[PDB]
Design a binder for this molecule. Structure first.
Ligand SMILES: O=C(Nc1ccc(OC(F)(F)Cl)cc1)c1cnc(N2CC[C@@H](O)C2)c(-c2ccn[nH]2)c1
Ligand SMILES: COc1cc2ncnc(Nc3ccc(Oc4ccccc4)cc3)c2cc1OC
Ligand SMILES: [Cl-]
Length: 420
């Protein structure tokens, strides 16, 4: 009804950004070039606001139980911390317009489809159809009516929506890491915590460091780290990226509390990384340094991938390479598929050192037959990483194929159930 409602809290602290509290009423006056920001007027003032942080009043997103387009296993992770009656309504990522209800009950997560009849009345069971989705959700929150339990408690959001650009349109240096290249720091103009990477050369050339970053600036995916800025005017070049509070994926995995980080969490991270790699491959970009250290962990196990196009740097890296990448200097997605298979072995092993096996002869060890089953790794997952390690690179599945497998691997089961 011409009005908008804020879905997430946003602190302004920006050029002309407007602070919004969840549930505030907004009148939208316009949008910026990319649409990631929109000018809004509220009872307090006028200013720019992230577009994904607010939704139209007539929108179905105004409801808490509607999480928009959500992966099936992402929804399963969302319901992992729930109780009986915990539920969410999601849009199918593979085919949009298809709606599903994910409902948690006694440790299980059940998925139901909201099918539309010839009348257009959406329904879950054929005996009760409704004109609108809100009617159906209200009815199934009143009685179960064919569901295993009533839709009682909408699931909370996993993370705030990702925005591209700190503004609609060198600086403070904090502590580095501790040791045992990348520093944490503050941007004053927007007063936000960022990560700054310094570098020397070899891969970081004179004109490549600027023309390559232009392609990197166009890297925009929820599971890919965002290149906020670059500073090439000083002998130490600065790479400004988002900040992830939990840091290294390998360090997280080795120190994590496995009761909180269970098999569903592991598949959530794997699906995130696979979707990031699918986005990178579909754009014809090669990561080249895929591994656990180059991934980062965020809130609610939000995983992002960094160090893409980095190739060199840090280095204080043999086992994550393709057999054809170090023998003949290959540049391909399939090498990244091999690195992804090693990464998934690491995830299945909770961060164990790969090939645990003489390094000085590992190449040969591969000319004939690869790591064995981790304890509890489902045979499907080992099969996937097995395909990811092929002597001929053409025989390895695409990252899109890997993601499609991952989503449909446990359609009639649970990864927690299929541990053994
Ligand atoms: O959950 C586990 N694996 C998993 C989860 C999700 C997967 O799918 C994906 F998609 F997420 Cl990769 C794939 C694998 C798991 C549980 N327990 C384990 N332990 C055995 C020794 C004991 O102390 C603890 C191990 C293990 C074996 C070797 N090291 N660790 C693994
Ligand atoms: C809490 O601990 C950490 C938090 C982090 N938060 C964000 N980023 C990190 N690492 C990073 C930063 C910039 C960078 O530069 C590039 C970015 C993309 C592509 C190429 C280069 C590479 C890695 C972090 C590292 C951390 O400890 C290892
Ligand atoms: Cl929306």
């Amino acid at each position: 009804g011409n009005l908008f409602v804020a879905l997430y809290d946003f602190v302004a602290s920006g050029d002309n950004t407007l602070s919004i509290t969840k549930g505030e009423k907004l009148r939208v006056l316009g949008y910026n070039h990319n649409g990631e920001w929109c000018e809004a007027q509220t009872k307090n003032g006028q200013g720019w606001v992230p577009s994904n942080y607010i939704t139209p009043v007539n929108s179905l997103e105004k409801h808490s139980w509607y999480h928009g387009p959500v992966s099936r296993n992402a929804a399963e992770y969302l319901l992992s911390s729930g109780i009986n009656g915990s539920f969410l309504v999601r849009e199918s990522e593979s085919s949009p317009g298809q709606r599903s209800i994910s409902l948690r009950y006694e440790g299980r997560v059940y998925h139901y489809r909201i099918n539309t009849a010839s009348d257009g009345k959406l329904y879950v069971s054929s005996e009760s159809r409704f004109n609108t989705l809100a009617e159906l959700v209200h009815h199934h929150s009143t009685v179960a009516d064919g569901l295993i339990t009533t839709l009682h408690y909408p699931a909370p959001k996993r993370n705030k929506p990702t925005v591209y650009g700190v503004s609609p349109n060198d600086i403070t240096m904090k502590h580095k890491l501790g040791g045992g290249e990348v520093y944490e720091g503050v941007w004053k103009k927007y007063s936000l915590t960022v990560a700054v990477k310094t570098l020397k050369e070899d891969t970081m050339e004179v004109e490549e460091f600027l023309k390559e970053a232009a392609v990197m600036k166009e890297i925009k995916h929820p599971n890919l780290v965002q290149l906020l800025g670059v500073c090439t005017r000083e002998p130490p070049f600065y790479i400004i990226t988002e900040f992830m509070t939990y840091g290294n994926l390998l360090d997280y995995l080795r120190e994590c509390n496995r009761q909180e980080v269970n098999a569903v969490v592991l598949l959530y991270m794997a699906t995130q990384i696979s979707s990031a790699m699918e986005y990178l491959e579909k754009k014809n970009f090669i990561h080249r340094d895929l591994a656990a250290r180059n991934c980062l962990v965020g809130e609610n196990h939000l995983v992002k991938v960094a160090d893409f196009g980095l190739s060199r740097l840090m280095t204080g890296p043999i086992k994550w390479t393709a057999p054809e990448s170090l023998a003949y200097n290959k540049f391909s997605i399939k090498s990244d598929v091999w690195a992804f298979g090693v990464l998934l072995w690491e995830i299945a092993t909770y961060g164990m050192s790969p090939y645990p096996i003489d390094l000085s002869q590992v190449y040969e060890l591969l000319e004939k037959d690869r790591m064995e089953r981790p304890e509890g790794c489902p045979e499907k997952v080992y099969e996937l990483m097995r395909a990811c390690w092929q002597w001929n690179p053409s025989d390895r599945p695409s990252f899109a194929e890997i993601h499609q497998a991952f989503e449909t691997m446990f359609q009639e089961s649970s990864i927690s159930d299929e541990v053994e």
